[PDB]
Design an enzyme around this catalytic site. Structure first.
Site, PDB file in Angstrom:
ATOM      1  N   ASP B  64       0.812  -1.203   0.000  1.00 53.86           N
ATOM      2  CA  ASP B  64       0.000   0.000   0.000  1.00 53.86           C
ATOM      3  C   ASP B  64       0.854   1.266   0.000  1.00 53.86           C
ATOM      4  OD1 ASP B  64      -1.865   2.155   1.098  1.00 53.86           O
ATOM      5  OD2 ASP B  64      -3.230   0.446   0.964  1.00 53.86           O
ATOM      6  N   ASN B 112      -9.598  -2.017  -7.802  1.00 52.96           N
ATOM      7  CA  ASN B 112      -8.733  -1.128  -8.584  1.00 52.96           C
ATOM      8  C   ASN B 112      -9.257  -0.708  -9.956  1.00 52.96           C
ATOM      9  OD1 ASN B 112      -6.911  -1.386  -6.466  1.00 52.96           O
ATOM     10  ND2 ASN B 112      -5.153  -1.686  -7.829  1.00 52.96           N
TER      11      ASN B 112
END
Lengths: 284, 284
Positions: B64, B112
């Site tokens: 991340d 995503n």
């Protein structure tokens, strides 16, 4: 803002853990009126002003550290769980005050059978009694409670008291509690896959039109939304099979305080933490 | 123990961040050794000599913070993901030094697709490139690398670069990276269940015999062991739907460091923390 307003200074408090089971205060009458206000904490703390849009819709809570709370004192594991019943109801009175709509409580998993028969036998019968003892308190407050969990090997008496509790409260809507007993995440997803395979056998469902929703519609309790905030107590950092499907995109917050040392102001601390934070991208 | 003894003074160091794409070190021969030893870090630092009994045989990671890094220095998001590539390979080398054998990786996510068409149309081409470029490196390191994800929307071209790298490293077994592109924790359950449904409808499976084992078997890669250590950087305390089913009882370790600054020594930090913890699985 959805929070109830700070209880009058003279409103009953909770809990008074000198007696056990802690006595739930006789609350003032209503004009009326319908759902009673929950007693205020013994400290008389008041909920924190948080917009209904910054709040967690659904707080899942992994109660943790009762066995260990007793053990640092020279006591039997199971006595800590007794100081837990009061904290449960406390946090419940806290969520109502706070303006929280859904609260999940991990009373007992499909994995707690590994423990001793002495502790498993105590928990089974203590959940049974707790339920019966609290059904009318919870009812009156605005709570809608019911059993969420798996059936294999679970004391029938636990499934009964809670279906009594479900019948009384299937119209309340101040808040909803999912009292999880013999709950396992994978086991609940397993239970629905044959909820599904069964319909497919009845040719009542196309195996190529199956969606995440299709699965979500065949879980035991299908109106349980996604878990916004995942409180897990006593320093442990794991979900432990709790709301597996539901708590996918959950934000985690791990308090290091044993559950029996816990109180509603702690619930409010976390919730504030959640709300006050800048929702990142894709983040609800 | 099982870690590899330290690499000699003048062993190849990784990464050399004086170029992009960063270049991988010409690695010493080792005949008649088997696979080539993983290069040591640029600091030539030491690996923790953790017991085999406190090792996370399966470590999953949600890399991340890749685009925050870039935002900070007035850069577009593309350039952040670029510097995180050499981070992966470097993190793969430390897992081997540390004796880990199952490494999961949240390269892309079903989530995503809600990112800018620009950023997403880029994240599909970069992964494809990385497999095509780095897969020979991994071939030699003993890495077994394969694809784990849903097909719909996923560029055919990405899937096939991993169907090629998978077929080349199928008999390798120093470690096993499951490269997750278009991964959805639920999306993989959903799909294991579409299978069950078909078999049930074809008359080959009876609904009442479906168990957790059966879902575990109808997964895309049903050989993946449960997840031991669940890492995520950036400061995000979420599973965000990674290895949802696998990580039911996993130990969540969270850090602030953004991915492009992350290096193997930090992965070693994590596993020492997992090392000091007590896992119990419903045990007292």
């Amino acid at each position: 803002f959805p929070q109830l307003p700070p209880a009058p200074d003279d409103y009953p408090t909770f809990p008074d853990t000198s007696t056990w089971p802690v006595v739930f205060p006789e609350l003032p009458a209503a004009p009326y009126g319908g759902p009673c206000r929950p007693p205020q904490h013994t400290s008389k703390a008041a909920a924190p002003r948080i917009p209904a849009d910054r709040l967690p819709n659904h707080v899942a809570i992994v109660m943790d550290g009762n066995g260990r709370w007793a053990t640092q004192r020279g006591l039997a594991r199971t006595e800590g769980h007794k100081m837990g019943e009061a904290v449960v109801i406390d946090i419940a009175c806290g969520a109502i005050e706070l303006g929280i709509k859904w609260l999940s409580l991990y009373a007992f998993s499909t994995e707690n059978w590994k423990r001793s028969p002495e502790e498993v036998r105590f928990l089974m019968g203590f959940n049974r009694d707790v339920v019966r003892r609290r059904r009318d308190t919870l009812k009156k407050l605005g709570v809608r409670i019911r059993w969420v969990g798996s059936r294999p090997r679970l004391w029938r008496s636990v499934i009964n008291e809670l279906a009594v509790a479900e019948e009384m409260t299937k119209s309340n809507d101040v808040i909803t509690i999912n009292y999880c007993v013999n709950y396992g995440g994978r086991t609940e997803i397993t239970e629905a896959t044959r909820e599904i395979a069964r319909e497919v056998a009845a040719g009542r469902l196309n195996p190529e039109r199956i969606t995440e929703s299709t699965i979500a519609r065949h879980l035991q309790r299908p109106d349980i939304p996604d878990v916004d905030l995942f409180l897990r107590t006593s320093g442990e950092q794991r979900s432990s099979n709790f709301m597996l499907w539901q708590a996918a995109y959950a934000e985690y917050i791990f308090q290091d305080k044993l559950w029996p040392d816990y109180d509603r102001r702690d619930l409010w601390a976390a919730c504030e933490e959640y709300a006050s934070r800048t929702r990142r991208f894709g983040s609800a």
